Amino acid sequence: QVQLQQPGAELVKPGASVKLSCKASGYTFTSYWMQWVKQRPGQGLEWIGEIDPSDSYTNYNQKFKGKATLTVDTSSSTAYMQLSSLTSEDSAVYYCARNRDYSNNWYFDVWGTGTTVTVSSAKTTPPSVYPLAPGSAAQTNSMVTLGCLVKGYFPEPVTVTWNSGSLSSGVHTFPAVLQSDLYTLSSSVTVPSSTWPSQTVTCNVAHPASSTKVDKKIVPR
Amino acid sequence: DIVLTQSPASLAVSLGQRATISCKASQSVDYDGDSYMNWYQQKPGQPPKLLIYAASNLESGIPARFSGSGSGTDFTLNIHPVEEEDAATYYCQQSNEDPRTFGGGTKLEIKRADAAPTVSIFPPSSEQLTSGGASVVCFLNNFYPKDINVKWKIDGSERQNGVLNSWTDQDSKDSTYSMSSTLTLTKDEYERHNSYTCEATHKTSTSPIVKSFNR
DSSP states (O other), X not given: OOEEEOOSEEEEOTTOOEEEEEEEESSOGGXXXXXXXXXXXXXXXXXXXXXXXTTTEEEEOGGGBTTEEEEEETTTTEEEEEEOSOOGGGOEEEEEEEEEEETTXXXXXXXXXXXXXXXXXXXXXXXXXXXXXXXXXXXOOSEEEEEEEEEEEBSSOOEEEEGGGTBOTTEEEEEEEEOSSOEEEEEEEEEETTTTTTSOOEEEEEETTTTEEEEEEOXXX | OOOEEEEOSEEEEETTSOEEEEEEESSOOEETTEEOEEEEEEOTTSOOEEEEEXXXXXXXXXXXXXXXXXXXXXXXXXXXXXXXXXXEEEEEEEOSSSSOEXXXXXXXXXXXXXXXXXXXXXXXXXXXXXXXXXXXEEEEEEEBSSOOEEEEEETTEEEOTTEEEEEOOOOTTTOOEEEEEEEEEEHHHHTTOOEEEEEEEOTTOSSOEEEEEEO
């Protein structure tokens, strides 16, 4: 299984720098060039540069020459990108992607999970997770909607799954909203009325930047 | 460098219809009868996915309803017939010269039949109350169109400050939207009132949809 893995997030102080990593697996690492792309919400995708792992030959986008440095470790099958003297404008999701050549035409066929980088003097804040139980009805429905409130965290992102992922149907996760330098997000899951009261339903939240995990069980009111 | 321009930026198409996405190159991306135009698809919270390379080559595993055409400076991505899972954002990318560049992207939306929202209201959790704050939450699930608004009424009175609203992107198997409204007050404010109501205004109804609870 071809895979490109990247850490979920990085919180950096303005004027500082970071080394983003991208671990490859499932293929001959040196057999293909590695690409790095930048994605800012609303702006779209931007190409940073490429590197040939076999000899470490690099090619940069003029715009990033002197901001990004690419290297690789053919021993551990890892590719790297250092970003220096970061500014708010550098906040974004960074992707590493495998390149492929077709009749001289280059395209990227496998993309990494992406890394959310946030530039700010603000400090990491783990989320406060609260269970949202209905606690009322009139036997007017066959399905029940439960939820979880993830509030007051920084920075993005957070991962929410239900019953470690066993529950995937009828699940909605709402994009986070920022208010007062802190993000708030919520998630819902709709299960059968015969399921919940008796079967334990739990919400699992992971916040990569703070390395914290919280599991909250939904208990009827 | 060669700039790519995608038109439009947003598109709404009906199920079973044809969606045509345009991409304009500032300069020719041709070379030996080979157009170096690639197309990617990106769904919310996911990395981009390769659809077509070299302008008209369908990557393996990609449904035949997707096709690409063009040469020189004009390219189009065609989806016919469009399906629900096709709700996403599409980007073109050229690999003729350096630097490599992408188009602004085009968000595709599926037009389906109206759907009224399912409303759920949740009072604050005991855990949250111990902390001195109080958040009342309302979920407005699986509706269409996405046009909707929520009003919060406390003891019959409208409240506007401390309300955070968030919509999801179009569903992948439903083509419906969902949204959550969160009303946050201090524990003392919450404890002085008894009736908490959230009423939604959607086109599938002449009168508001009300959902409430009493402390």
